[PDB]
Amino acid sequence: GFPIPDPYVWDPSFRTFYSIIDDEHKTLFNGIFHLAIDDNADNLGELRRCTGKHFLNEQVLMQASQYQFYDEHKKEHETFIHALDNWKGDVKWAKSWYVNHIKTIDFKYKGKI
Amino acid sequence: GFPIPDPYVWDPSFRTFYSIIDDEHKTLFNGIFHLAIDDNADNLGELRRCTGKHFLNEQVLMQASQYQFYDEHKKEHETFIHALDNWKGDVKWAKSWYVNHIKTIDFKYKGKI
Amino acid sequence: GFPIPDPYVWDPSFRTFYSIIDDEHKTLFNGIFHLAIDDNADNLGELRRCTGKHFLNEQVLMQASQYQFYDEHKKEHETFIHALDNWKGDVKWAKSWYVNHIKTIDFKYKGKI
Amino acid sequence: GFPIPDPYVWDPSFRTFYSIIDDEHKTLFNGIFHLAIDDNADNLGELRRCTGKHFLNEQVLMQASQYQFYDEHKKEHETFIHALDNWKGDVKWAKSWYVNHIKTIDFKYKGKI
Amino acid sequence: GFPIPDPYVWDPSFRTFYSIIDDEHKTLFNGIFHLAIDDNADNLGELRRCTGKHFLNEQVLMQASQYQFYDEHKKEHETFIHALDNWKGDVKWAKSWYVNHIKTIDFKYKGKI
Amino acid sequence: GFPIPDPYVWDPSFRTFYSIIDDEHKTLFNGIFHLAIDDNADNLGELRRCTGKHFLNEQVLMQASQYQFYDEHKKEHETFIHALDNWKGDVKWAKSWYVNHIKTIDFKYKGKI
Amino acid sequence: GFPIPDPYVWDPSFRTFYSIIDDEHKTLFNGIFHLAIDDNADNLGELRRCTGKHFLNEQVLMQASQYQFYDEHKKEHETFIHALDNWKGDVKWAKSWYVNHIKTIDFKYKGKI
Amino acid sequence: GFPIPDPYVWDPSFRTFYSIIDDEHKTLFNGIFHLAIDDNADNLGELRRCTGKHFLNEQVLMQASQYQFYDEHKKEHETFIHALDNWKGDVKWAKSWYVNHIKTIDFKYKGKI
């Protein structure tokens, strides 16, 4: 499936064409990047802040045009957040979860919010 | 009943006298214009975006002034959005639904928000 | 009791010392003013707009500083709004209630929001 | 050549059809009303704050839609603001100036901002 | 060098892929659409406002990312505003200028703001 | 344990590194500082005000990033508001509570909001 | 001529009755409070940052109502910033200048912004 | 004098301790990272947009607290933007220019904006 970039960086293939959402995704990629390089509390903290913030803003933009698939996308966001709140050290899974998230879940909203 | 403009474009007879609201209505007539020329998913998505944003935006405006008949107006919106989330291709009903909504349901909030 | 200013205009004895709230009280006085001269549907509407609009803005600021007496003040607001939405031309009562509302319920939030 | 209201209160003939502008004009009328009754520095100060505010807000409305006649309108606003800053007590002039400004100068922007 | 739609109405070929900018164009199109049918002062001012408002909104959009060609873009806006301010009644030129502005000048900012 | 500064003035050792949050922390120190010198209604009011504002402002900063320990932090806040709303003149506890709140409860959100 | 607090903390005698502005004044008093204790670079930057933020924030408030004495006030503001930018260690002169700034110059904008 | 990351990614050592600013630096690094790999027109624009946005946001933050060294910092920003407006493909210069820009010029505004 979806190739996990390496180095774990955001590439134009992730584009939603929503400049704001795009730039936040870039910062999130950077978050996990360091996470895999040192699973520590500070990196997790930085990523955890960045994630939840971005996850809320995207839900905000979705709710603003009453996005049809808001709930499923919100359930999704809750999942990765729960994961981050009960970390087991699985960086690979986060890497693949995050990529598959933008490409199959975020992508559903392109042209709709 | 209310005449359906052909071409399905917005005209001054639809004015609510709230500029921002009148402008969003012009864009909404446009979404249904194309949705009748080619019932595709991009045109439905473009309409579903504009509609839902407008519906919410117009509801935010009603709540700012604690609009008295906000509930029936919200019921009106949920139906057309519902229709759009269960689309059958009856662009005629969509065309006549919006015209009446503006002139009968949107018109009520005139001077009241 | 509280003197019902005649003409029914806002005056300095009604200062909450909140400039934006004060400017909105002036506008609302003018609503009751015309409503007393012509009890029609538009005058009632104009008032019902500024009133509901004013009450909300005031509830927002009260909440911003977690105003201790917020519930009581909201039951008040609603009472007037219910009254406006159930008009019976009682302009004198509307004049007095508003006079007492600023002077007793509004004056409580002074220096607290 | 417009009639000076008595009492100097705002009435519907003054509507520009822009609710927030109409609300600001209602307050502005109140400030000259008290200044007329008592020309004190406090009543002036109040009117001056309200006039400096409304003139700016309104000017911002005009610059938003790149109003065609902004400069003439601004020159006007600076004229009353100037009269207020070199107040000579001519409360009769002030009343007709403001009554005319909205009825000739403000009315000109109706449907353009 | 681009074909003038008939009826003069916005279409997806006109996409800049920026939702708000795209929605505003649909409103501006409606504006010239009516100015073509009836060249009166009402229709012209409606167009002028929506034109003045959109050109500014877009210019701020370009300024927020320090667009490289904001200057040449600005001047072009001023050309059509000047035309509107000094209207000779050339509804033909108006229709092509705008269709061509969006596709040759707006398009330049695609992915840059 | 934690040293209650004398005079009760916010010092750099209370830094959360969120400038806006620290400035509000400087003003909350001021309120307590006065309430200590004179337990009166007007000093209590002042404190109750900045306090509730800061508590909400900080809760809105926490919820932005979907903070993990938002609840315990809300409970904490509610406790101190209750104290203020059921004032027993215990200015010592307040001085100790607040110093301890920042350093053990606010300090938790550093890098996380 | 105004009395310099000791400790150099803000007190209700300072209130301009603009809650937001008053709160900023508190933080500002704290900045210079510590500069008096330790003239170090950090204490000066913290202060300097606070003076720049408030001074600009307050000038935005004055411009919002076109304050009559904005130019003079801005010149006062520049005098302090300049002394902070060309610091000679005169912490005594800084304490009076600021107490005297709010008590004589800021106080002039009371009921005017 | 600072080492260039490899891969060219933002790392904790580049912290300004301003979350959003650091969140913006993280994305900028990514913009030049790809441009190094493939110097195409598209990558240049993604970087050029982000560089424009960030530079403005930051200059606005510096303007907010009236940063003493704002002027000097604005010229530095103009250097990179100018270079990006007259791109000759010198990716190595850009890698080091940015790395040094934040570590020496940005770092100067720490605790001052």
From Swiss-Prot, chains A, B, C, D, E, F, G, H:
Domain of life where this protein originates: Eukaryota
Family annotation (Pfam families): Hemerythrin (PF01814)
GO molecular function: iron ion binding; oxygen carrier activity
Transmembrane segment boundaries: none
CDD domains per record: Hemerythrin-like
UniProt keyword list: Iron, Metal-binding, Oxygen transport, Transport
Binding site for Fe cation 2: 58, 73, 77, 101, 106
Positions annotated to bind Fe cation 1: 25, 54, 58, 106
Outcome following mutation: residue 63 to E: In minor component
Assembly behavior: Homooctamer.
Family: Belongs to the hemerythrin family.
Protein purpose: Hemerythrin is a respiratory protein in blood cells of certain marine worms. The oxygen-binding site in each chain contains two iron atoms.
Miscellaneous comment in the UniProt entry for this protein: The sequence from one of the four major component variants is shown.
Protein name: Hemerythrin
Species the sequence originates in: Phascolopsis gouldii
